[PDB]
Amino acid sequence: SALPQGNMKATATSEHPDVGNEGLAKFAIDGKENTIWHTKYNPVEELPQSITLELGGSYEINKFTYLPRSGAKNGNITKYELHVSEDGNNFRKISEGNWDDSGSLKTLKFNSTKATHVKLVALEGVGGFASAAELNVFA
Ligand SMILES: CC(=O)N[C@H]1[C@H](O[C@@H]2[C@@H](O)[C@H](O)O[C@H](CO)[C@@H]2O)O[C@H](CO)[C@H](O)[C@@H]1O
Ligand SMILES: [Ca+2]
Ligand code: NA
Known part of the structure; x- marks a missing residue:
């Protein structure tokens, strides 16, 4: 079951200002x-770039989902790392891989691990950008 996004805070290395339906980090968890x-x-900031979710406490987590934007593909993430931290400072890599560029939900499963923060690092994305409609973290 998903940890409540409402308790989360989102920050990113790069974000586009609020021009509507994009591009602030907080939009990834709304x-x-x-x-x-x-x-x-x-002008464009090149990859890699990341987004960090402060969970709102320490939880043992085992799954992550990335929902891409709908109706366009720019920034759909095709190569990633997932990192966790328990202190907001030190991060450790727990997952890495590739995703197809379609609009479909991408799901990561990993061994249960304690975290207060999860960071999604975008190494590759359609158009040289990174974007996300929704990010969720599961215990
Ligand atoms: C609606 C949309 O997809 N906007 C993204 C935008 O995508 C393209 C532009 O690259 C192009 O110049 O013009 C198109 C008109 O159909 C469309 O707006 O590109 C942005 C990055 O440059 C960003 O990805 C927008 O989300
Ligand atoms: Ca959203
Ligand atoms: Na934090």
Whole structure:
């Protein structure tokens, strides 16, 4: 079951200002599929870039989901790392891999681990950007 996004805070290395349905980091956890976090594209900041979710406490987590934007593909993430921290400072890599560029939900499962923060690192994305409609973390 998903940890409540409402208790979370989102920050990112790069984010596009609020021009509607993009591109602030907080849009990745607002519960709306029509709103997205998107990395700066004026002018563009190159990958890699990341987004960090402060969980709102220490939880033991085993799953992560990435929902891409709908109706367009720019920034759909195709190569990632997932890192965790228990102190907000030190991060450790727990997952890495590839995703297809489609709009489909991407799911990561991993051995249960304690975390106060989860960081999604975007190494590759459509168009040289990174974006996300919704991010969720599961215990
Ligand atoms: C609606 C949309 O997809 N906006 C993204 C935007 O995508 C393209 C532009 O790249 C192009 O110049 O014009 C298109 C018109 O159909 C469309 O707006 O590109 C942005 C990054 O440059 C960002 O990804 C927008 O989310
Ligand atoms: Ca959203
Ligand atoms: Na934090």
